[PDB]
Amino acid sequence: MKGAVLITGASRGIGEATARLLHAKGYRVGLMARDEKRLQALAAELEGALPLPGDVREEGDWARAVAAMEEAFGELSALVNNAGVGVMKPVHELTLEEWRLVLDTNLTGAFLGIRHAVPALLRRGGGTIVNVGSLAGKNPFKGGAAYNASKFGLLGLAGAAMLDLREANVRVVNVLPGLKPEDVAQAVLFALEMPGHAMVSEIELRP
Amino acid sequence: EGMKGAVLITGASRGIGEATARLLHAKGYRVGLMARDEKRLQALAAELEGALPLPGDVREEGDWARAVAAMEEAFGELSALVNNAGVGVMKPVHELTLEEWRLVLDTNLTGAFLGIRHAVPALLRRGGGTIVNVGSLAGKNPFKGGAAYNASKFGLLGLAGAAMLDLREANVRVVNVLPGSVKLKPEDVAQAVLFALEMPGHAMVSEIELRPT
Ligand SMILES: [Co+2]
Ligand SMILES: [Co+2]
């Protein structure tokens, strides 16, 4: 009875470390990821976890994932918006398709996560939404136009969302890594157990 | 008189956009008026001789391609771009539809990207130029109902920051013009946009912050 937590980009990096940590801590986690091959292996490692291969950009996949969490665990206590991809090229060399891939996955994906998760959290009397910040701090860098745009956008989305859901006992917390994936994973764990009283809205880790 | 530059302005039919158009044109700059409301663009184009009415949607690469090209055919070149297009839908984050969300982000954020993508080549043709982004307070201060608006305004700074680092070696200056922290008239912003454009070349300005006096 630790709480059902949905995690995007769970097949690798921070997502995987987070998945592994929460599962080893008694959390019943849902693993959302695009890479089916990796997810399949992780689904057998974390027995009990709910493997949910899909596309964070698709609103349909989000409906199915949240519905699946409630059907398998009876509820959704938290969402960890981690999913994040990049395409490092000079701003004027990026194509619309590349721009969209990053923005739709990193930013639109988080928005959809929130939209589809809130209704499920409300039915549980509340919950937590954790967003993973940029893995390169909050300073612009060459070739990062799309990436920075998505990560900065994410903060704006999270800031407004925090104010919106605050009275419905839904805490929006940002975990901003900008070392090791196991580190960020620890930060996410803290955000899920420590707060609760809806006060901490941002945890930052040293570069 | 008649060789100050050719500037393409988005959201030119109203507010800051229109104020920038009137000033720059009065100062000798050739201007392209980009906005969706064709009637208002035509009306404003009539008030300014030479002004190029370029109705179009900043979300479409197609309209940007045609706009920039129209600029080069009418004025022989494009010297600068001013991003001022914007739309707003405010409401609780989870109550926002995917459609309402895309309207805001594609127009306010993707629109600037497409603008940089299609204006740069025309600027590289003449050896350089300027891209001015009109910022917003919503770019730093979250607020109830601003999920999509804040996200697009925060993201704009991310895009702009990396953009200036990518283009500075090609002599393309990306400068941001935005409000202070804590009323600012449309004419005041137009003035800042004016300076950003006309200033000597040497470790120039990357950002100009304004506030009501
Ligand atoms: Co993944
Ligand atoms: Co209009």
Would you list the domain boundaries of chain B? 1-213
Distance of residue A130 Cα from the nearest chain B Cα, in angstroms? 15
Of B109, B146, B164, the CB nearest to A160: B146
Identify the three-state secondary structure at position A130: strand
Cα of A143 vs centre of ligand 1, distance in Å, is 22
Distance of residue B49 Cα from the nearest chain A Cα, in angstroms? 32
Other beta carbons less than 10 A from residue B97's beta carbon? 12
Q: CB of B85 within 8 A of CB of B10? A: yes
Other beta carbons less than 10 A from residue B175's beta carbon? 23
User: Which residue is it, tokens 């930052």?
Assistant: A204
Here the contacts of B187-194 (C-beta below 8 Å, separation 24 or greater) are B187/B19, B187/B23, B188/B212, B189/B16, B189/B19, B189/B20, B189/B134, B190/B16, B190/B19, B190/B20, B190/B22, B190/B23, B190/B24, B191/B23, B193/B20, B193/B23, B193/B24, B193/B82, B193/B132, B193/B134, B194/B20, B194/B23, B194/B24, B194/B27
What sections of A82-144 are H helices per DSSP?
96-103, 109-122
Tell me the residue type at A207. P
- Is 3.40.50.300 the CATH classification of the domain at A1-207? no
Question: Cβ of B79 under 8 Å from any chain A Cβ?
Answer: no
Contact criterion met (CB < 8 Å) for B144 and A161: no
DSSP-assigned states of every residue in A145-185: HHHHHHHHHHHHHHHHHHHHHGGGTEEEEEEE----HHHHH
Question: Cβ of B167 under 8 Å from any chain A Cβ?
Answer: yes
Contact criterion met (CB < 8 Å) for A160 and B93: yes
Distance of residue B142 Cα from the nearest chain A Cα, in angstroms? 5
Contact criterion met (CB < 8 Å) for B142 and A162: yes
Distance of residue B180 Cα from the nearest chain A Cα, in angstroms? 18
Question: Cβ of A120 under 8 Å from any chain B Cβ?
Answer: no
Question: Cβ of A72 under 8 Å from any chain B Cβ?
Answer: no
Contact criterion met (CB < 8 Å) for A149 and B139: no
Of B61, B105, B163, the CB nearest to A145: B163
Task: Single out the residue of B54, B74, B164 nearest to residue B120, CA to CA.
Answer: B164
Question: Cβ of A161 under 8 Å from any chain B Cβ?
Answer: yes
Contact criterion met (CB < 8 Å) for B109 and A149: yes
Question: Cβ of B195 under 8 Å from any chain A Cβ?
Answer: no
User: Could you give the CA distance from residue B46 to residue A90 in angstroms, rounded to a whole number?
Assistant: 39
From which experimental method does this structure derive? X-ray
| Residues of A known to be catalytic | 147
Angle between helices A36-45 and A13-24 (to 10 degrees): 20
User: Could you give the CA distance from residue A78 to residue A171 in angstroms, rounded to a whole number?
Assistant: 9
Task: Single out the residue of B60, B72, B61, B80 nearest to residue B9, CA to CA.
Answer: B80
Q: What is the DSSP letter of A197?
A: S
Task: Single out the residue of A178, A184, A167, A172 nearest to residue A207, CA to CA.
Answer: A178
**Resolution limit in angstroms?**
2.4
Contact criterion met (CB < 8 Å) for B105 and A100: no
Cα of B35 vs centre of ligand 2, distance in Å, is 5
Question: Cβ of B81 under 8 Å from any chain A Cβ?
Answer: no
User: Which residue is it, tokens 């470790």?
Assistant: B203
Q: Which of B64, B75, B113, B149 is catalytic?
A: B149
Q: CB of B7 within 8 A of CB of B80? A: yes
Interface test with A, best of B113, B131, B137, B149 (most A CBs within 10 A): B113
User: Could you give the CA distance from residue A31 to residue A82 in angstroms, rounded to a whole number?
Assistant: 11
Q: CB of A109 within 8 A of CB of B102? A: no
Q: CB of A129 within 8 A of CB of A157? A: no
Of B93, B98, B159, the CB nearest to A148: B159
CATH architecture for segment(s) B1-213: 3-Layer(aba) Sandwich (3.40)
Task: Single out the residue of B19, B70, B77 nearest to residue B48, CA to CA.
Answer: B19
Identify the three-state secondary structure at position A129: strand
- What phi and psi, each to the nearest 5 degrees, are found at residue A130? -105, 130
B200 Cβ contact partners less than 8 Å away, ≥ 6 residues apart: none
What are A52's two structure tokens? Answer: 């949910």
